[PDB]
Design a protein around this motif. Structure first.
Motif, short mmCIF file in Angstrom:
data_model
loop_
_atom_site.label_atom_id
_atom_site.label_comp_id
_atom_site.label_asym_id
_atom_site.label_seq_id
_atom_site.Cartn_x
_atom_site.Cartn_y
_atom_site.Cartn_z
N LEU A 323 7.35 88.70 74.32
CA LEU A 323 6.04 88.81 74.97
C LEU A 323 4.92 88.22 74.13
O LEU A 323 3.78 88.15 74.61
CB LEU A 323 5.74 90.27 75.26
N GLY A 324 5.23 87.87 72.89
CA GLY A 324 4.28 87.33 71.93
C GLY A 324 3.33 88.39 71.39
O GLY A 324 2.18 88.10 71.10
N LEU A 325 3.82 89.64 71.25
CA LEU A 325 3.00 90.74 70.74
C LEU A 325 3.39 91.03 69.30
O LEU A 325 4.55 91.34 69.04
CB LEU A 325 3.26 92.00 71.59
N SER A 326 2.44 90.91 68.37
CA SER A 326 2.77 91.22 66.96
C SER A 326 2.96 92.71 66.74
O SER A 326 3.75 93.11 65.88
CB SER A 326 1.72 90.65 66.01
N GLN A 327 2.23 93.54 67.52
CA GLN A 327 2.32 94.99 67.48
C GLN A 327 2.09 95.61 68.86
O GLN A 327 1.52 94.98 69.76
CB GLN A 327 1.24 95.59 66.55
N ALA A 328 2.39 96.91 68.96
CA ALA A 328 2.05 97.75 70.09
C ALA A 328 1.89 99.14 69.55
O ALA A 328 2.49 99.49 68.54
CB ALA A 328 3.16 97.73 71.15
N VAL A 329 1.09 99.95 70.23
CA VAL A 329 1.11 101.36 69.91
C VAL A 329 2.29 101.92 70.72
O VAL A 329 2.51 101.49 71.86
CB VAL A 329 -0.21 102.20 69.88
N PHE A 330 3.14 102.71 70.07
CA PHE A 330 4.32 103.24 70.73
C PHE A 330 4.15 104.70 71.02
O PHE A 330 3.97 105.48 70.10
CB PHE A 330 5.57 103.02 69.86
N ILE A 331 4.25 105.08 72.30
CA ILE A 331 4.12 106.47 72.74
C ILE A 331 5.40 106.81 73.48
O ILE A 331 5.71 106.15 74.47
CB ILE A 331 2.88 106.74 73.63
N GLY A 332 6.11 107.80 72.99
CA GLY A 332 7.37 108.22 73.61
C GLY A 332 7.40 109.70 73.97
O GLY A 332 6.68 110.49 73.37
N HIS A 333 8.24 110.06 74.94
CA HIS A 333 8.48 111.47 75.37
C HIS A 333 9.97 111.66 75.38
O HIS A 333 10.70 110.77 75.83
CB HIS A 333 7.90 111.76 76.78
#
Ligand SMILES: COc1ccc(NC(=O)Nc2cccc(-c3ncn(C[C@@H]4CCCO4)c3-c3nc4c(N)ncnc4s3)c2)cc1
Ligand SMILES: COc1ccc(NC(=O)Nc2cccc(-c3ncn(C[C@@H]4CCCO4)c3-c3nc4c(N)ncnc4s3)c2)cc1
Lengths: 546, 546
Positions: A323-333
């Motif tokens: 996707l060409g994303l160097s980072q993302a905030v990751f939210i999991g359940h």
């Protein structure tokens, strides 16, 4: 007989009215009363403002014309306009100050929920100012909640011209007596009344809503707090990324800003985040709601090892790469929360911030087998039931509607008693064939989960539990690490599987850990307490994730 | 015998080496020579740095340990470290200053183009610093160009340990004599040499590449300027949005930052932007490359009126609404360029900035029928040929490979002579059955267009030309407007259909219009001159669109 509700924008769905700023300006600059309002309406149907409202010219072309009218008016009134008088500044400030009238929006939302066709009818302009995005953002937030948005500058007609009312009626496919029309301008209300529509002159919101409630027979005032906006699956942008030859990941995408990757649990869907997706996008984030590997439209290979944490994490890193994303905030359940802690430990350069709902982070014991820990606690007996390939699949796949109706229950709704699942011979042995519908879900929402699970069943989802040894070995490599990136742990008081006390020692490995806590909340956090989840997540994102 | 090339990161693919900053710091702070480098390697295989490189600890856990080693070294050397000495500051600056070694990357790219398997083998760390994104961005840019990325902290092994070399060979599926291994550290080169690999000690890039060229027999130095990075369709994120019941729009998505919506022309694809997509994403933009209505994976309804500018624009506004985007920068080429000017005129609040390749903006003549204007110019005869439903479809669909090979040609490649198309009875009547392949395209790229057009054919695409009257009527409503949002007009010298002189009066309606001009460029701008298109677009985006 009433079946449609029409709302004006300025002074009705949005406050303070941009029009009322002409009066405030006159008062603040001690100009003759009505001077600015008179220059604004100068020339009437043939004047500069009507040309703007019909879409003949843009707002930036109108600004000099309004300034010339202001000069003409001041000349006649024998007054002088101040040294640094600016129509642009005045309008920039007025537009920016105008916010959604939340109780008016709530009333429109309730009427639409009860089967009314709703529309916004507004005298507006083509906004080409450098600061136009603010208004674009507001129109986007508002319009999504209505069946129709009719803008004067797009239709080339203006209120109070009778043609715009006939156009509204044609758009509504309704006769005038079937329509409630709310406006703050009495002159713009007159042709709707003359046609036979029910009309409400809006001064203060409370009185307008009392008239609206009386005429519709629908409770709109003093109503309970509504649920956050949900998602209609067919209205979302659906994304698909091939991470490896036989594996593609599906996601739903909404909003702009920092990437926020939502990771659901077992046995769920991207749709489990339905109440969070619109709210996080509105908060200024680009939401990527996954179908985790094994679920929905994502690939579900049969092999157990395709679902070990090391491979799942590697694939999520590939997902970001493609996707060409160097980072993302990751939210999991749930299982998603487990994965996000692993992403933070193994790929911190790719994780902007990490947050988990319910799932604690517990370091691996390098001396004890993970299966020994599960056997020691009676609550985790269902996990041993999930071990043998085929057994839980047969039970969970037998009747899909029964599976989701039994699973998805609030803390006070007799949720599955998970003690001695193996001994009993299954999860639903003491459960009804036709469970009642939880207050958390509609029948339609259950049928969405049923439809999604018809594609791949429960093999891939159950395989997340079938890598205890592999996950333990990989987790042991992280034993000397700490999580030092921004981290949030959200506990749910009444989750009896992922109990709040299980997270108690997390600060030993995550020293700067921030927390959230939700009372009277069971396992299904997002749908149990969506308003509170949204509040906790938005506050933490704005403070710690950008 | 050579078929694989392995590159180190620090001092080989990225310069200046982060390691060389320890020496620069000693010199700048007048510390004893080697003091910092000695504290860095303190403890050797059992020291803090090896633990970091193996992934036992993160970079933020390593910082205090390096500081303690620095204190121990200074004590023994009988020196004092400065008042505000900071290992964090030193490393933050070193990492940020490290950039890709462009000629080394070019050489790796050429070797891979010639069939070599390429890999990056690096001693690296788990980066959890607040500024980690810079390094994440660099690793992303680099890694996409290689078959494998092997990082010490992920594999738990470090150079010069022999296990990492056996792991590399197993990953490459190659015997040592088949591998060239490039490293700036002689000690890390020794085990590869001892195994029988060809080794290159990298000091200055030019000498390393001369050795690399000599050993591979491949020209890597003094080579012509390469084309920008292209797209592999199966490696992209594919997005899908339903804008109305029978219409879905497909797009390819890459990157983060302000939304940039690319709008292709006739008879094209999202793939026509293949050289722009990676470059714009790398420049800090979120690229959304459309399949316009009627094309590729987007819906292609048969009705002529589904392709009038008013409906196409309304759908693009709905596309933004469903994705939760308040605005996008709109960049169009050919018919896409026509649409983007219309988006700027009718929906300025949704258009962050507008740019067109080749397509000028010409205001409608409220006195003359649009068909009269087309008949007056002999170059536009093909448009009259495109009018009758079925005629052009039959010719363009007869042999797809022939259609694209005849169409997609550079200015010096005998492009279709479009005079008297109707008289001749078609576009390809004087064209060969088996056209030669243009220098702009590969056979594989033609087969991509052929495959895309097999789904819907030419009906929807030709329908863009079949709304002259409808478009003229809608354009007349905009006659009193000006485009006052940021605008770029890019002319192509040798486009004989959309000639540069056709754009000459645009400043009368777009006063602040910015321009670009590409010499020796035909109609197919993006593939004819991709390097120059990228240069013009990135410069304008950074200055005018954010
Ligand atoms: C019947 O329908 C359902 C639906 C969902 C669930 N939810 C779960 O099973 N959630 C879940 C997800 C991930 C891990 C766990 C979990 N359940 C027990 N433990 C054991 C730990 C070890 C010692 C104390 O508890 C773990 C964990 N596994 C890990 C791991 N592999 N790595 C790190 N921390 C943990 S906590 C539970 C249960 C029944
Ligand atoms: C044979 O293969 C091909 C492939 C692509 C093309 N490309 C085009 O046909 N490009 C294209 C796209 C959009 C509009 C036009 C165009 N071609 C002629 N005119 C007429 C104008 C009017 C007076 C001077 O030229 C227009 C334009 N149509 C409009 C419009 N509807 N609104 C505003 N400006 C224009 S320019 C051409 C041609 C042959």
């Amino acid at each position: 007989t009433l079946r449609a509700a029409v709302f004006d924008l300025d002074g009705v769905l949005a406050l303070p009215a941009v029009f009322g700023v002409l009066g405030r300006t006159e008062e603040a600059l001690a100009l003759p009363r009505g001077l600015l309002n008179d220059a604004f309406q100068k020339g009437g149907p043939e004047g500069a403002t009507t040309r703007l409202m019909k879409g003949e010219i843009t707002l930036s072309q109108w600004i000099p014309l309004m300034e010339e009218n202001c000069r003409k008016c001041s000349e006649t009134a024998k007054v002088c306009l101040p040294k640094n008088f600016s129509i642009k500044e005045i309008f920039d400030k007025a537009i920016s100050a105008r916010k959604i009238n939340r109780p008016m929006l709530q009333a429109a939302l309730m009427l639409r929920k009860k089967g009314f066709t709703t529309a916004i009818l507004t005298n507006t302009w083509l906004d080409d100012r450098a600061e136009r995005d603010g208004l674009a953002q507001l129109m986007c937030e508002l319009k999504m909640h209505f069946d129709f948005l009719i803008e004067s500058c797009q239709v080339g007609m203006v209120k109070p011209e009778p043609q715009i009312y006939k156009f509204l009626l044609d758009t509504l496919k309704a006769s005038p007596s079937e329509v409630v029309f709310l406006d703050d301008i009495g002159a713009n209300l007159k042709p709707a009344r003359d046609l036979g529509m029910v009309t409400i002159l809006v001064q203060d919101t409370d009185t307008a809503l009392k008239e609206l409630e009386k005429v519709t027979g629908i409770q709109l005032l003093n109503t309970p707090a509504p649920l956050p906006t949900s998602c209609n699956p067919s209205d979302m942008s659906h994304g698909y990324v091939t991470v490896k030859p036989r594996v593609r990941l599906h996601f739903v995408e909404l909003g702009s800003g920092p990437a926020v990757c939502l990771c659901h649990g077992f046995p769920e869907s991207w749709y489990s985040w339905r109440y969070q997706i619109p709210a996080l996008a509105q908060a200024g984030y680009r939401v990527l709601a996954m179908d985790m590997k094994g679920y929905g439209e994502s690939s579900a290979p049969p092999e157990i090892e395709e679902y070990c944490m090391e491979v799942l994490c590697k694939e999520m890193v590939t997902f970001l790469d493609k996707l060409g994303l160097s980072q993302a905030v990751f939210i999991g359940h749930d299982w998603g929360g487990m994965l996000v802690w692993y992403m933070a430990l193994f790929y911190p350069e790719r994780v902007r911030a990490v947050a988990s709902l319910n799932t604690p982070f517990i370091p691996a014991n390098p001396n004890m087998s993970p299966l020994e820990s599960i056997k020691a606690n009676p609550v985790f007996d269902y996990q041993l039931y999930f071990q043998e390939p085929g057994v839980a699949e047969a039970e969970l796949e037998q009747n899909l509607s029964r599976t989701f109706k039994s699973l998805f229950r609030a803390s006070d709704e007799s949720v599955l008693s998970m003690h001695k699942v193996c001994e009993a011979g299954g999860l639903f042995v003491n459960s009804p064939e036709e469970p009642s519908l939880s207050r958390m879900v509609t029948e339609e929402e259950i049928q969405f989960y049923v439809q999604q699970f018809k594609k791949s069943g429960f093999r891939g989802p159950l395989n997340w539990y079938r890598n205890m040894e592999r996950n333990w070995k990989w987790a042991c490599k992280s034993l000397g690490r700490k999580i030092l990136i921004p981290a949030l742990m959200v506990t749910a008081e009444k989750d009896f599987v992922l109990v709040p006390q299980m997270s108690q020692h997390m600060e030993d490995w995550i020293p700067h850990l921030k927390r959230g806590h939700i009372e009277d909340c069971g396992h299904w956090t997002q749908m149990d307490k969506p308003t509170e989840v949204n509040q906790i997540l938005i506050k933490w994102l704005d403070s710690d994730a950008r």
